[PDB]
Amino acid sequence: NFINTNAANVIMGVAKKPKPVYVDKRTGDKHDLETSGLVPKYINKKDYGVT
Amino acid sequence: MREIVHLQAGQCGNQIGAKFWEVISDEHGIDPTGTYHGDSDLQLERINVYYNEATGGKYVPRAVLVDLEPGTMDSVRSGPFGQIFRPDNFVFGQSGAGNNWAKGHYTEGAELVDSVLDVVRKEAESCDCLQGFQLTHSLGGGTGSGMGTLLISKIREEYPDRIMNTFSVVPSPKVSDTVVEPYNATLSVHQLVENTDETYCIDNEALYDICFRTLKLTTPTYGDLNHLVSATMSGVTTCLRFPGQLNADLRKLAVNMVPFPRLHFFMPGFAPLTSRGSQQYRALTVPELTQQMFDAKNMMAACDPRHGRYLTVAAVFRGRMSMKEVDEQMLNVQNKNSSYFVEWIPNNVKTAVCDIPPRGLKMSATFIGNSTAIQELFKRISEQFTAMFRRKAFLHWYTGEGMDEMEFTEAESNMNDLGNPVVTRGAC
Amino acid sequence: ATNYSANQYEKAFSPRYLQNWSLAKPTKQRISSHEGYTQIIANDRGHLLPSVPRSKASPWGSFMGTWDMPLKVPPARVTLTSRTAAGAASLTKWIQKNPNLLKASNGLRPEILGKPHD
Amino acid sequence: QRECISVHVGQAGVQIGNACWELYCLEHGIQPDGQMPSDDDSFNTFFSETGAGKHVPRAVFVDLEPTVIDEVRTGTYRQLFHPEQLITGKEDAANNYARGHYTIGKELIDLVLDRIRKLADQCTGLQGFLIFHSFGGGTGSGFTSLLMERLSVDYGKKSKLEFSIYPAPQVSTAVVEPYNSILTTHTTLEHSDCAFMVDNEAIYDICRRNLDIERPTYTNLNRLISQIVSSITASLRFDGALNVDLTEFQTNLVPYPRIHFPLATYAPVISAEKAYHEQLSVAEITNACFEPANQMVKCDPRHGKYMACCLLYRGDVVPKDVNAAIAAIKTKRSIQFVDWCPTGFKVGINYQPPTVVPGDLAKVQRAVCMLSNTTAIAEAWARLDHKFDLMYAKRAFVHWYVGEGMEEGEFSEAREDMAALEKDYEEVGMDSVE
Amino acid sequence: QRECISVHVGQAGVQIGNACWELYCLEHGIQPDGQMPSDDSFNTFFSETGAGKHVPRAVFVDLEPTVIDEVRTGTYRQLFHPEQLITGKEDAANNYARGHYTIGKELIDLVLDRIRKLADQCTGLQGFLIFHSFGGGTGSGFTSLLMERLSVDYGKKSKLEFSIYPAPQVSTAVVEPYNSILTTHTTLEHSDCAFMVDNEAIYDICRRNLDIERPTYTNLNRLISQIVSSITASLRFDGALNVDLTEFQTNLVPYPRIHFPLATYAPVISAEKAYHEQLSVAEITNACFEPANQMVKCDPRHGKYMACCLLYRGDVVPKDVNAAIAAIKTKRSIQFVDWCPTGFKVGINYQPPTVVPGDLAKVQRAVCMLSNTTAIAEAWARLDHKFDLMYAKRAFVHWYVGEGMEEGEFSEAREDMAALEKDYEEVGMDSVE
Numbered sequence A: 001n002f003i004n005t006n007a008a009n010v011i012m013g014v015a016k017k018p019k020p021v022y023v024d025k026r027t028g029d030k031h032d033l034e035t036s037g038l039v040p041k042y043i044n045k046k047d048y049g050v051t
Numbered sequence B: 001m002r003e004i005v006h007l008q009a010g011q012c013g014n015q016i017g018a019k020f021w022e023v024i025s026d027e028h029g030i031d032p033t034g035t036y037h038g039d040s041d042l043q044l045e046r047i048n049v050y051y052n053e054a055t056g057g058k059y060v061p062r063a064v065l066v067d068l069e070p071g072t073m074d075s076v077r078s079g080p081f082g083q084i085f086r087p088d089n090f091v092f093g094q095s096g097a098g099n100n101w102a103k104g105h106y107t108e109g110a111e112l113v114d115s116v117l118d119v120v121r122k123e124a125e126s127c128d129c130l131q132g133f134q135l136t137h138s139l140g141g142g143t144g145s146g147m148g149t150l151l152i153s154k155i156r157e158e159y160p161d162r163i164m165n166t167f168s169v170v171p172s173p174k175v176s177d178t179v180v181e182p183y184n185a186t187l188s189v190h191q192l193v194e195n196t197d198e199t200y201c202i203d204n205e206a207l208y209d210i211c212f213r214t215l216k217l218t219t220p221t222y223g224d225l226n227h228l229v230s231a232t233m234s235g236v237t238t239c240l241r242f243p244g245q246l247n248a249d250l251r252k253l254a255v256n257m258v259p260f261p262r263l264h265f266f267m268p269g270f271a272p273l274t275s276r277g278s279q280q281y282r283a284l285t286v287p288e289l290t291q292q293m294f295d296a297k298n299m300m301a302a303c304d305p306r307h308g309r310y311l312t313v314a315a316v317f318r319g320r321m322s323m324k325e326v327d328e329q330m331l332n333v334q335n336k337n338s339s340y341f342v343e344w345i346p347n348n349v350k351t352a353v354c355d356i357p358p359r360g361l362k363m364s365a366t367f368i369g370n371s372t373a374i375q376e377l378f379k380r381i382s383e384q385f386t387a388m389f390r391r392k393a394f395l396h397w398y399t400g401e402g403m404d405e406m407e408f409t410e411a412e413s414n415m416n417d418l419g420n421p422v423v424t425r426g427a428c
Numbered sequence C: 001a002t003n004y005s006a007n008q009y010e011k012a013f014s015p016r017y018l019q020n021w022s023l024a025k026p027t028k029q030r031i032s033s034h035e036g037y038t039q040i041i042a043n044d045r046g047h048l049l050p051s052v053p054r055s056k057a058s059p060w061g062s063f064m065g066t067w068d069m070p071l072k073v074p075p076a077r078v079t080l081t082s083r084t085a086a087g088a089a090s091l092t093k094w095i096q097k098n099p100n101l102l103k104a105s106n107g108l109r110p111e112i113l114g115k116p117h118d
Numbered sequence D: 001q002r003e004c005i006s007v008h009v010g011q012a013g014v015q016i017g018n019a020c021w022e023l024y025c026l027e028h029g030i031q032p033d034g035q036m037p038s039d040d041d042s043f044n045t046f047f048s049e050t051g052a053g054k055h056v057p058r059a060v061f062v063d064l065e066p067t068v069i070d071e072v073r074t075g076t077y078r079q080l081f082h083p084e085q086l087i088t089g090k091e092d093a094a095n096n097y098a099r100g101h102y103t104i105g106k107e108l109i110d111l112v113l114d115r116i117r118k119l120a121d122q123c124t125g126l127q128g129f130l131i132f133h134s135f136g137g138g139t140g141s142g143f144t145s146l147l148m149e150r151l152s153v154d155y156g157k158k159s160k161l162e163f164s165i166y167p168a169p170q171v172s173t174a175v176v177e178p179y180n181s182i183l184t185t186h187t188t189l190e191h192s193d194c195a196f197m198v199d200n201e202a203i204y205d206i207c208r209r210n211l212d213i214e215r216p217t218y219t220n221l222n223r224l225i226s227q228i229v230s231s232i233t234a235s236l237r238f239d240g241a242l243n244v245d246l247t248e249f250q251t252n253l254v255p256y257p258r259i260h261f262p263l264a265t266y267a268p269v270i271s272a273e274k275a276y277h278e279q280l281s282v283a284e285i286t287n288a289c290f291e292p293a294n295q296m297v298k299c300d301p302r303h304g305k306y307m308a309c310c311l312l313y314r315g316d317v318v319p320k321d322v323n324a325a326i327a328a329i330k331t332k333r334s335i336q337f338v339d340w341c342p343t344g345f346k347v348g349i350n351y352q353p354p355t356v357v358p359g360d361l362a363k364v365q366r367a368v369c370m371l372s373n374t375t376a377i378a379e380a381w382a383r384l385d386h387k388f389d390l391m392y393a394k395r396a397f398v399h400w401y402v403g404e405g406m407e408e409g410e411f412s413e414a415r416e417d418m419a420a421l422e423k424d425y426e427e428v429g430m431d432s433v434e
Numbered sequence E: 001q002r003e004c005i006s007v008h009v010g011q012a013g014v015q016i017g018n019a020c021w022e023l024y025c026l027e028h029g030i031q032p033d034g035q036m037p038s039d040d041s042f043n044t045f046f047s048e049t050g051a052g053k054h055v056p057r058a059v060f061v062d063l064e065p066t067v068i069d070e071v072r073t074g075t076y077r078q079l080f081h082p083e084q085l086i087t088g089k090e091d092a093a094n095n096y097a098r099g100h101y102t103i104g105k106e107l108i109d110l111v112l113d114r115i116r117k118l119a120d121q122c123t124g125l126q127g128f129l130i131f132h133s134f135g136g137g138t139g140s141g142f143t144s145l146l147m148e149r150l151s152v153d154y155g156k157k158s159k160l161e162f163s164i165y166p167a168p169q170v171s172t173a174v175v176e177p178y179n180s181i182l183t184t185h186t187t188l189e190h191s192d193c194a195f196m197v198d199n200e201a202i203y204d205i206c207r208r209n210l211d212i213e214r215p216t217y218t219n220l221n222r223l224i225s226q227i228v229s230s231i232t233a234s235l236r237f238d239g240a241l242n243v244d245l246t247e248f249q250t251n252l253v254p255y256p257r258i259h260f261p262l263a264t265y266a267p268v269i270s271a272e273k274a275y276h277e278q279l280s281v282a283e284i285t286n287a288c289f290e291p292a293n294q295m296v297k298c299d300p301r302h303g304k305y306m307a308c309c310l311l312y313r314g315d316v317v318p319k320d321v322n323a324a325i326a327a328i329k330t331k332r333s334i335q336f337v338d339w340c341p342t343g344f345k346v347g348i349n350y351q352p353p354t355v356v357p358g359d360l361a362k363v364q365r366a367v368c369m370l371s372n373t374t375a376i377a378e379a380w381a382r383l384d385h386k387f388d389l390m391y392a393k394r395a396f397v398h399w400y401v402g403e404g405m406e407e408g409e410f411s412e413a414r415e416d417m418a419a420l421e422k423d424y425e426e427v428g429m430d431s432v433e
């Protein structure tokens, strides 16, 4: 029963946690957020403040 | 020497006081630049009641302009008599009241009350013997009601022995101009009752009636409507501005019209009013002035005095006129109409007769009436408020700005506890 | 920065008068006078002294950006007037179930006024 | 000291924007280059002098797809809008609220909120934020929600009106509109202030009957929506008799919390030929705004009760004739009115006669614009629900939404609160029998 | 009496110097052939020799020819004394070692001599403005060698180190991580103010604010030159609040270690966008804070300001500057550390920024902020993470070990760099009491 299969498929699904991308210019230029320095990413390391 | 500090709050207060300053500048001879260009020496004799002296013969109004939206003052400045006020008395704030009594009283207007009271303090201490304050506002809506009554309370706790006259534009019986006029009127009247010493209630529908039926105006504007309120304003402060016999200033008028402290709501009236087809049919005499005074056609509040009893009555005349005619007419009206006046006050009418009329007439007459018919206005606001308050309608913003249920309950109960002493005199 | 008060001249240096329309930092009104010297809390390098019970917040400010903010953001205004008990509970549990939005530099700062009909 | 930031979001927006800002310009003189051909400060409500005599529009056009905004960056008004106030993106949002409040929309939010801040840090007294969108589209329903919510986080209890194109009562230009519309109302029910609603089907008829345009396009319609934005903002640009600011429409209209969906209706929308035979008098203009064939939102106001109606008379309107008209309309027992609103007719009498764009509509020396909150908008919410359900029943076209970031459940919470909204219109309707 | 000597080091420095001196020669009229076309304001940067010739008080130094052997055949060959331009004969080949131990101990002698001569023809030296890339050999190796000896000699004399810092993503060197950690371990206790201007940042700023999609190292140097001409406008032109070089340190560097201030400029328009902009003191100031107009890819919002120094060149009425800093001190987006109540230096000059036939526009007012944000922790963390992705596998260590740098150093260096992390964190915490 394809109605019930499609309904179960859309009911029991988690979506993405989508990838964070930011646009800087008026034109629409996309840049990834993690690789750029405009995010706390390397603050939360394991060797911070310790040898 | 006596002085009056003129406060104008709100859009309505600003416009009415702008027309009033035009009226009194015409009466005193002050040109738009601010000099004197006149004919009689009787105009500078008592000019230190609304005008402060400046350098080189400049006369500047002693008026504080208050509004939380600096847009109506802009039109007032762009008008003819715009460059007459102090720029330092233009106390405005960048905001929008949005017709909230709560926002005009318990928020952003409270951020302007300090500057307003600074200017009021400066004007009050720049005097020899201050007698009181004249605030112009509209009960229906914000700024004039909320911020206006906040200044009323503040100025009353600063100066407790000065006459406070509130020219209040009350909500209309037929149509309305703000949705939350029952709320604003209820809270503002609750503030007005235990505060001001004199309240003149002007209703716009009554203004339309006296502009269409009496004046026979074809296109009445708010300038025209404001002008008659301004005429009553100029009429009431006449005895301390021009010489005459039986002078009656504001405190003498207050003494002779309030029998009890809560019964200070009045009904103004001006009556050299004649139509364009009928000023040449006019039969000028003091008895027609009394007749056109007392009839329920020139009342500037929408309260028929024939539906009640007159507690107290005042007439301030303006012109060289005999005393026998005035006295006999205002004994004759009481002797003829006996069910419209209270019996426990014998001769419940006052008379003042000054000598110098407005420029253009020969006799003028200002009517003040404390009557039972204001029960109709306060009761009408009462069922409008009750119908709006049972369902908690439009209470969203009044409680979002900080107020409570007990505020509105206390306001309605106080306005009913004033509706009771008004009606107890109709049944003695 | 402490954002002190200019006492008499504050209507100028109010946030909405200096053309700042975003919800701004408050101003410290009453200045508290202390007496005597104040002991050193750190060392030459700037590290705190060992005893010195420290704070618990992050060393950096909690600027919660457009990807760290919770979805279905609660409203800034909530006055619970002419509203049912269930809807009032839903809105209050919403603004209580978003805690990190309430404690942030770019936070919400909600206004929770009114009272629902029992 | 009366500026109004306008954030136009989506084709509809960018397009109503073109119309709105053309009228704005022809009204204050600002030519299609900024330079005002003077040889005074009223323009500040919408424009910002650079000092070199260039007046720059105070707006932030935002559209995840190019095209629309790009035709504005290369057209008559290409030198007015500061480049960084026309913020487009690269990819569209396929009529999917999801990719407007979650994926291809949460990327342009940072920059748009940025521009909005600079256009706010230059205002000496902001009145509000007029957001123009379409309830039925990616950016229109998606970016608006995110923008509205993030705005509330910053500008907290600051006014935020919402002129919108409400889903049609029969036509419709999409198959997924119903969904986007219900989702949008939910995220903005508590974050928006007074969202005005204009249906397109309605204007289409008002243009075939009252404006003699047999085949109306989106521009004929857009230009009439510009006349409405003028009257709503006229008081804070031109002198009048009863000024009405943009903070009073939230108080003298929105009655109870949720209910915040006023409806628009214009007056003297006549057409040259049929104006050589009409005294367009205050009364005629008013009675017309309450006729169930002019309401620019197909929703027969007769099948419901009025809750709050704020009229805005722009032109030569004797104050007395206004009081007279409102009285007559009140008597008429056809027009109804809830009991909890004795006084339900607000009035604003400005003086500047409606501006004539070299294009359509007659030169009227008088015109009104009503903004009532009829309980008759309930039919519309019911119709939107029939639609949302006829599809949600088979979880149709939901794969796309779960295919962005909208957890299936959200669809339920949305329609459930839309059902609450309908139950609200029932209560605010019933009249206490006591 | 207000002289300052520039010690441009490395190809990076020798090229930032070209633009800088073009702007310095323009500002004071000094022609490309060293001859002011028929007053004493050039003495801050140019000394006048008997034969009416204003020679530059600078020492361009590269451990290879080429870069400087192109300034000696360029349009500015009759300006620089044919001895200031000191050149080696073998590049340090991206090896701090071949620039602090090998090819370098053979040039330090001459360099310090030319510095002494230029530093003896100066009554009052405000300080030495050094320019180096935190990536290449000369830029790291020599700068250290120079700074260390510069200290021994000119002790108290300031030593401002304008420097190009490794970028978040882009980078034109695989041995960059190492070199950087090494130089910032030796120039951490022998330097003073170290202004960092990352390229990725400028590259972006250009595309965004000037619309130059594909820029070039020139477009960059020019903008870096306007930053230096702003730090040294009071030592030459007239102002309302003048700030000496000595001040930029005292009122910026909090604790000895935290000596790495960041940089940002205002009116960065392109003579076409500047037609729709007002460029008012408020617009220019709020932009010097906007995270998109910073010269080091790093959102300061995710950090805490420690001491911002805002310079104002042009028609800046004092009250404007006040309302601006005041609106900043109210916005929540910007937050400060607790130990810094007052946190803003203000320098109001009068000379409008000059236009060098290039990209920016003629503007009436313009600002330049040097904030000491703690948001630069990410930079040190990132940089060290990379030094550790390699100094773990002992990669490219044979090169440095074979020119001196006894392997041991790499370790001691990363240890001090771990202390940098600690400091930045602790020097930004709080106290419940």
Ligand SMILES: Nc1nc2c(ncn2[C@@H]2O[C@H](COP(=O)(O)OP(=O)(O)OP(=O)(O)O)[C@@H](O)[C@H]2O)c(=O)[nH]1
Binding pocket: D009, D010, D011, D012, D013, D015, D016, D065, D092, D093, D094, D095, D133, D134, D135, D136, D137, D138, D139, D140, D141, D165, D172, D173, D174, D200, D218, D219, D221, D222
């Ligand atoms: N006046 C006017 N209304 C429009 C215009 N375009 C669309 N609309 C209305 O708005 C609805 C959809 O418009 P939008 O939501 O703005 O479309 P969008 O968000 O830009 O989405 P896409 O362009 O399809 O990517 C349609 O059903 C129309 O009724 C327009 O250009 N002018």
Ligand SMILES: Nc1nc2c(ncn2[C@@H]2O[C@H](COP(=O)(O)OP(=O)(O)OP(=O)(O)O)[C@@H](O)[C@H]2O)c(=O)[nH]1
Binding pocket: E010, E011, E012, E015, E016, E064, E091, E092, E093, E094, E133, E134, E135, E136, E137, E138, E139, E140, E164, E172, E173, E199, E217, E218, E220, E221, E222
């Ligand atoms: N303005 C400008 N900046 C430059 C130029 N060339 C390099 N840079 C900067 O300098 C950095 C690299 O400098 P270094 O690696 O130290 O150059 P080096 O030490 O001389 O090394 P070699 O050229 O191989 O001898 C680059 O990342 C750029 O940021 C230039 O020509 N002009």
Ligand SMILES: Nc1nc2c(ncn2[C@@H]2O[C@H](COP(=O)(O)OP(=O)(O)O)[C@@H](O)[C@H]2O)c(=O)[nH]1
Binding pocket: B009, B010, B011, B012, B015, B016, B097, B099, B138, B139, B140, B141, B142, B143, B144, B145, B169, B177, B178, B204, B222, B223, B225, B226, B229, D241, D242
């Ligand atoms: N007499 C007179 N009344 C006015 C005038 N302008 C406005 N009003 C009255 O003012 C009332 C509304 O003013 P209000 O809402 O208080 O303005 P606000 O104080 O700015 O909020 C209306 O009912 C009008 O009748 C005028 O020029 N003359």
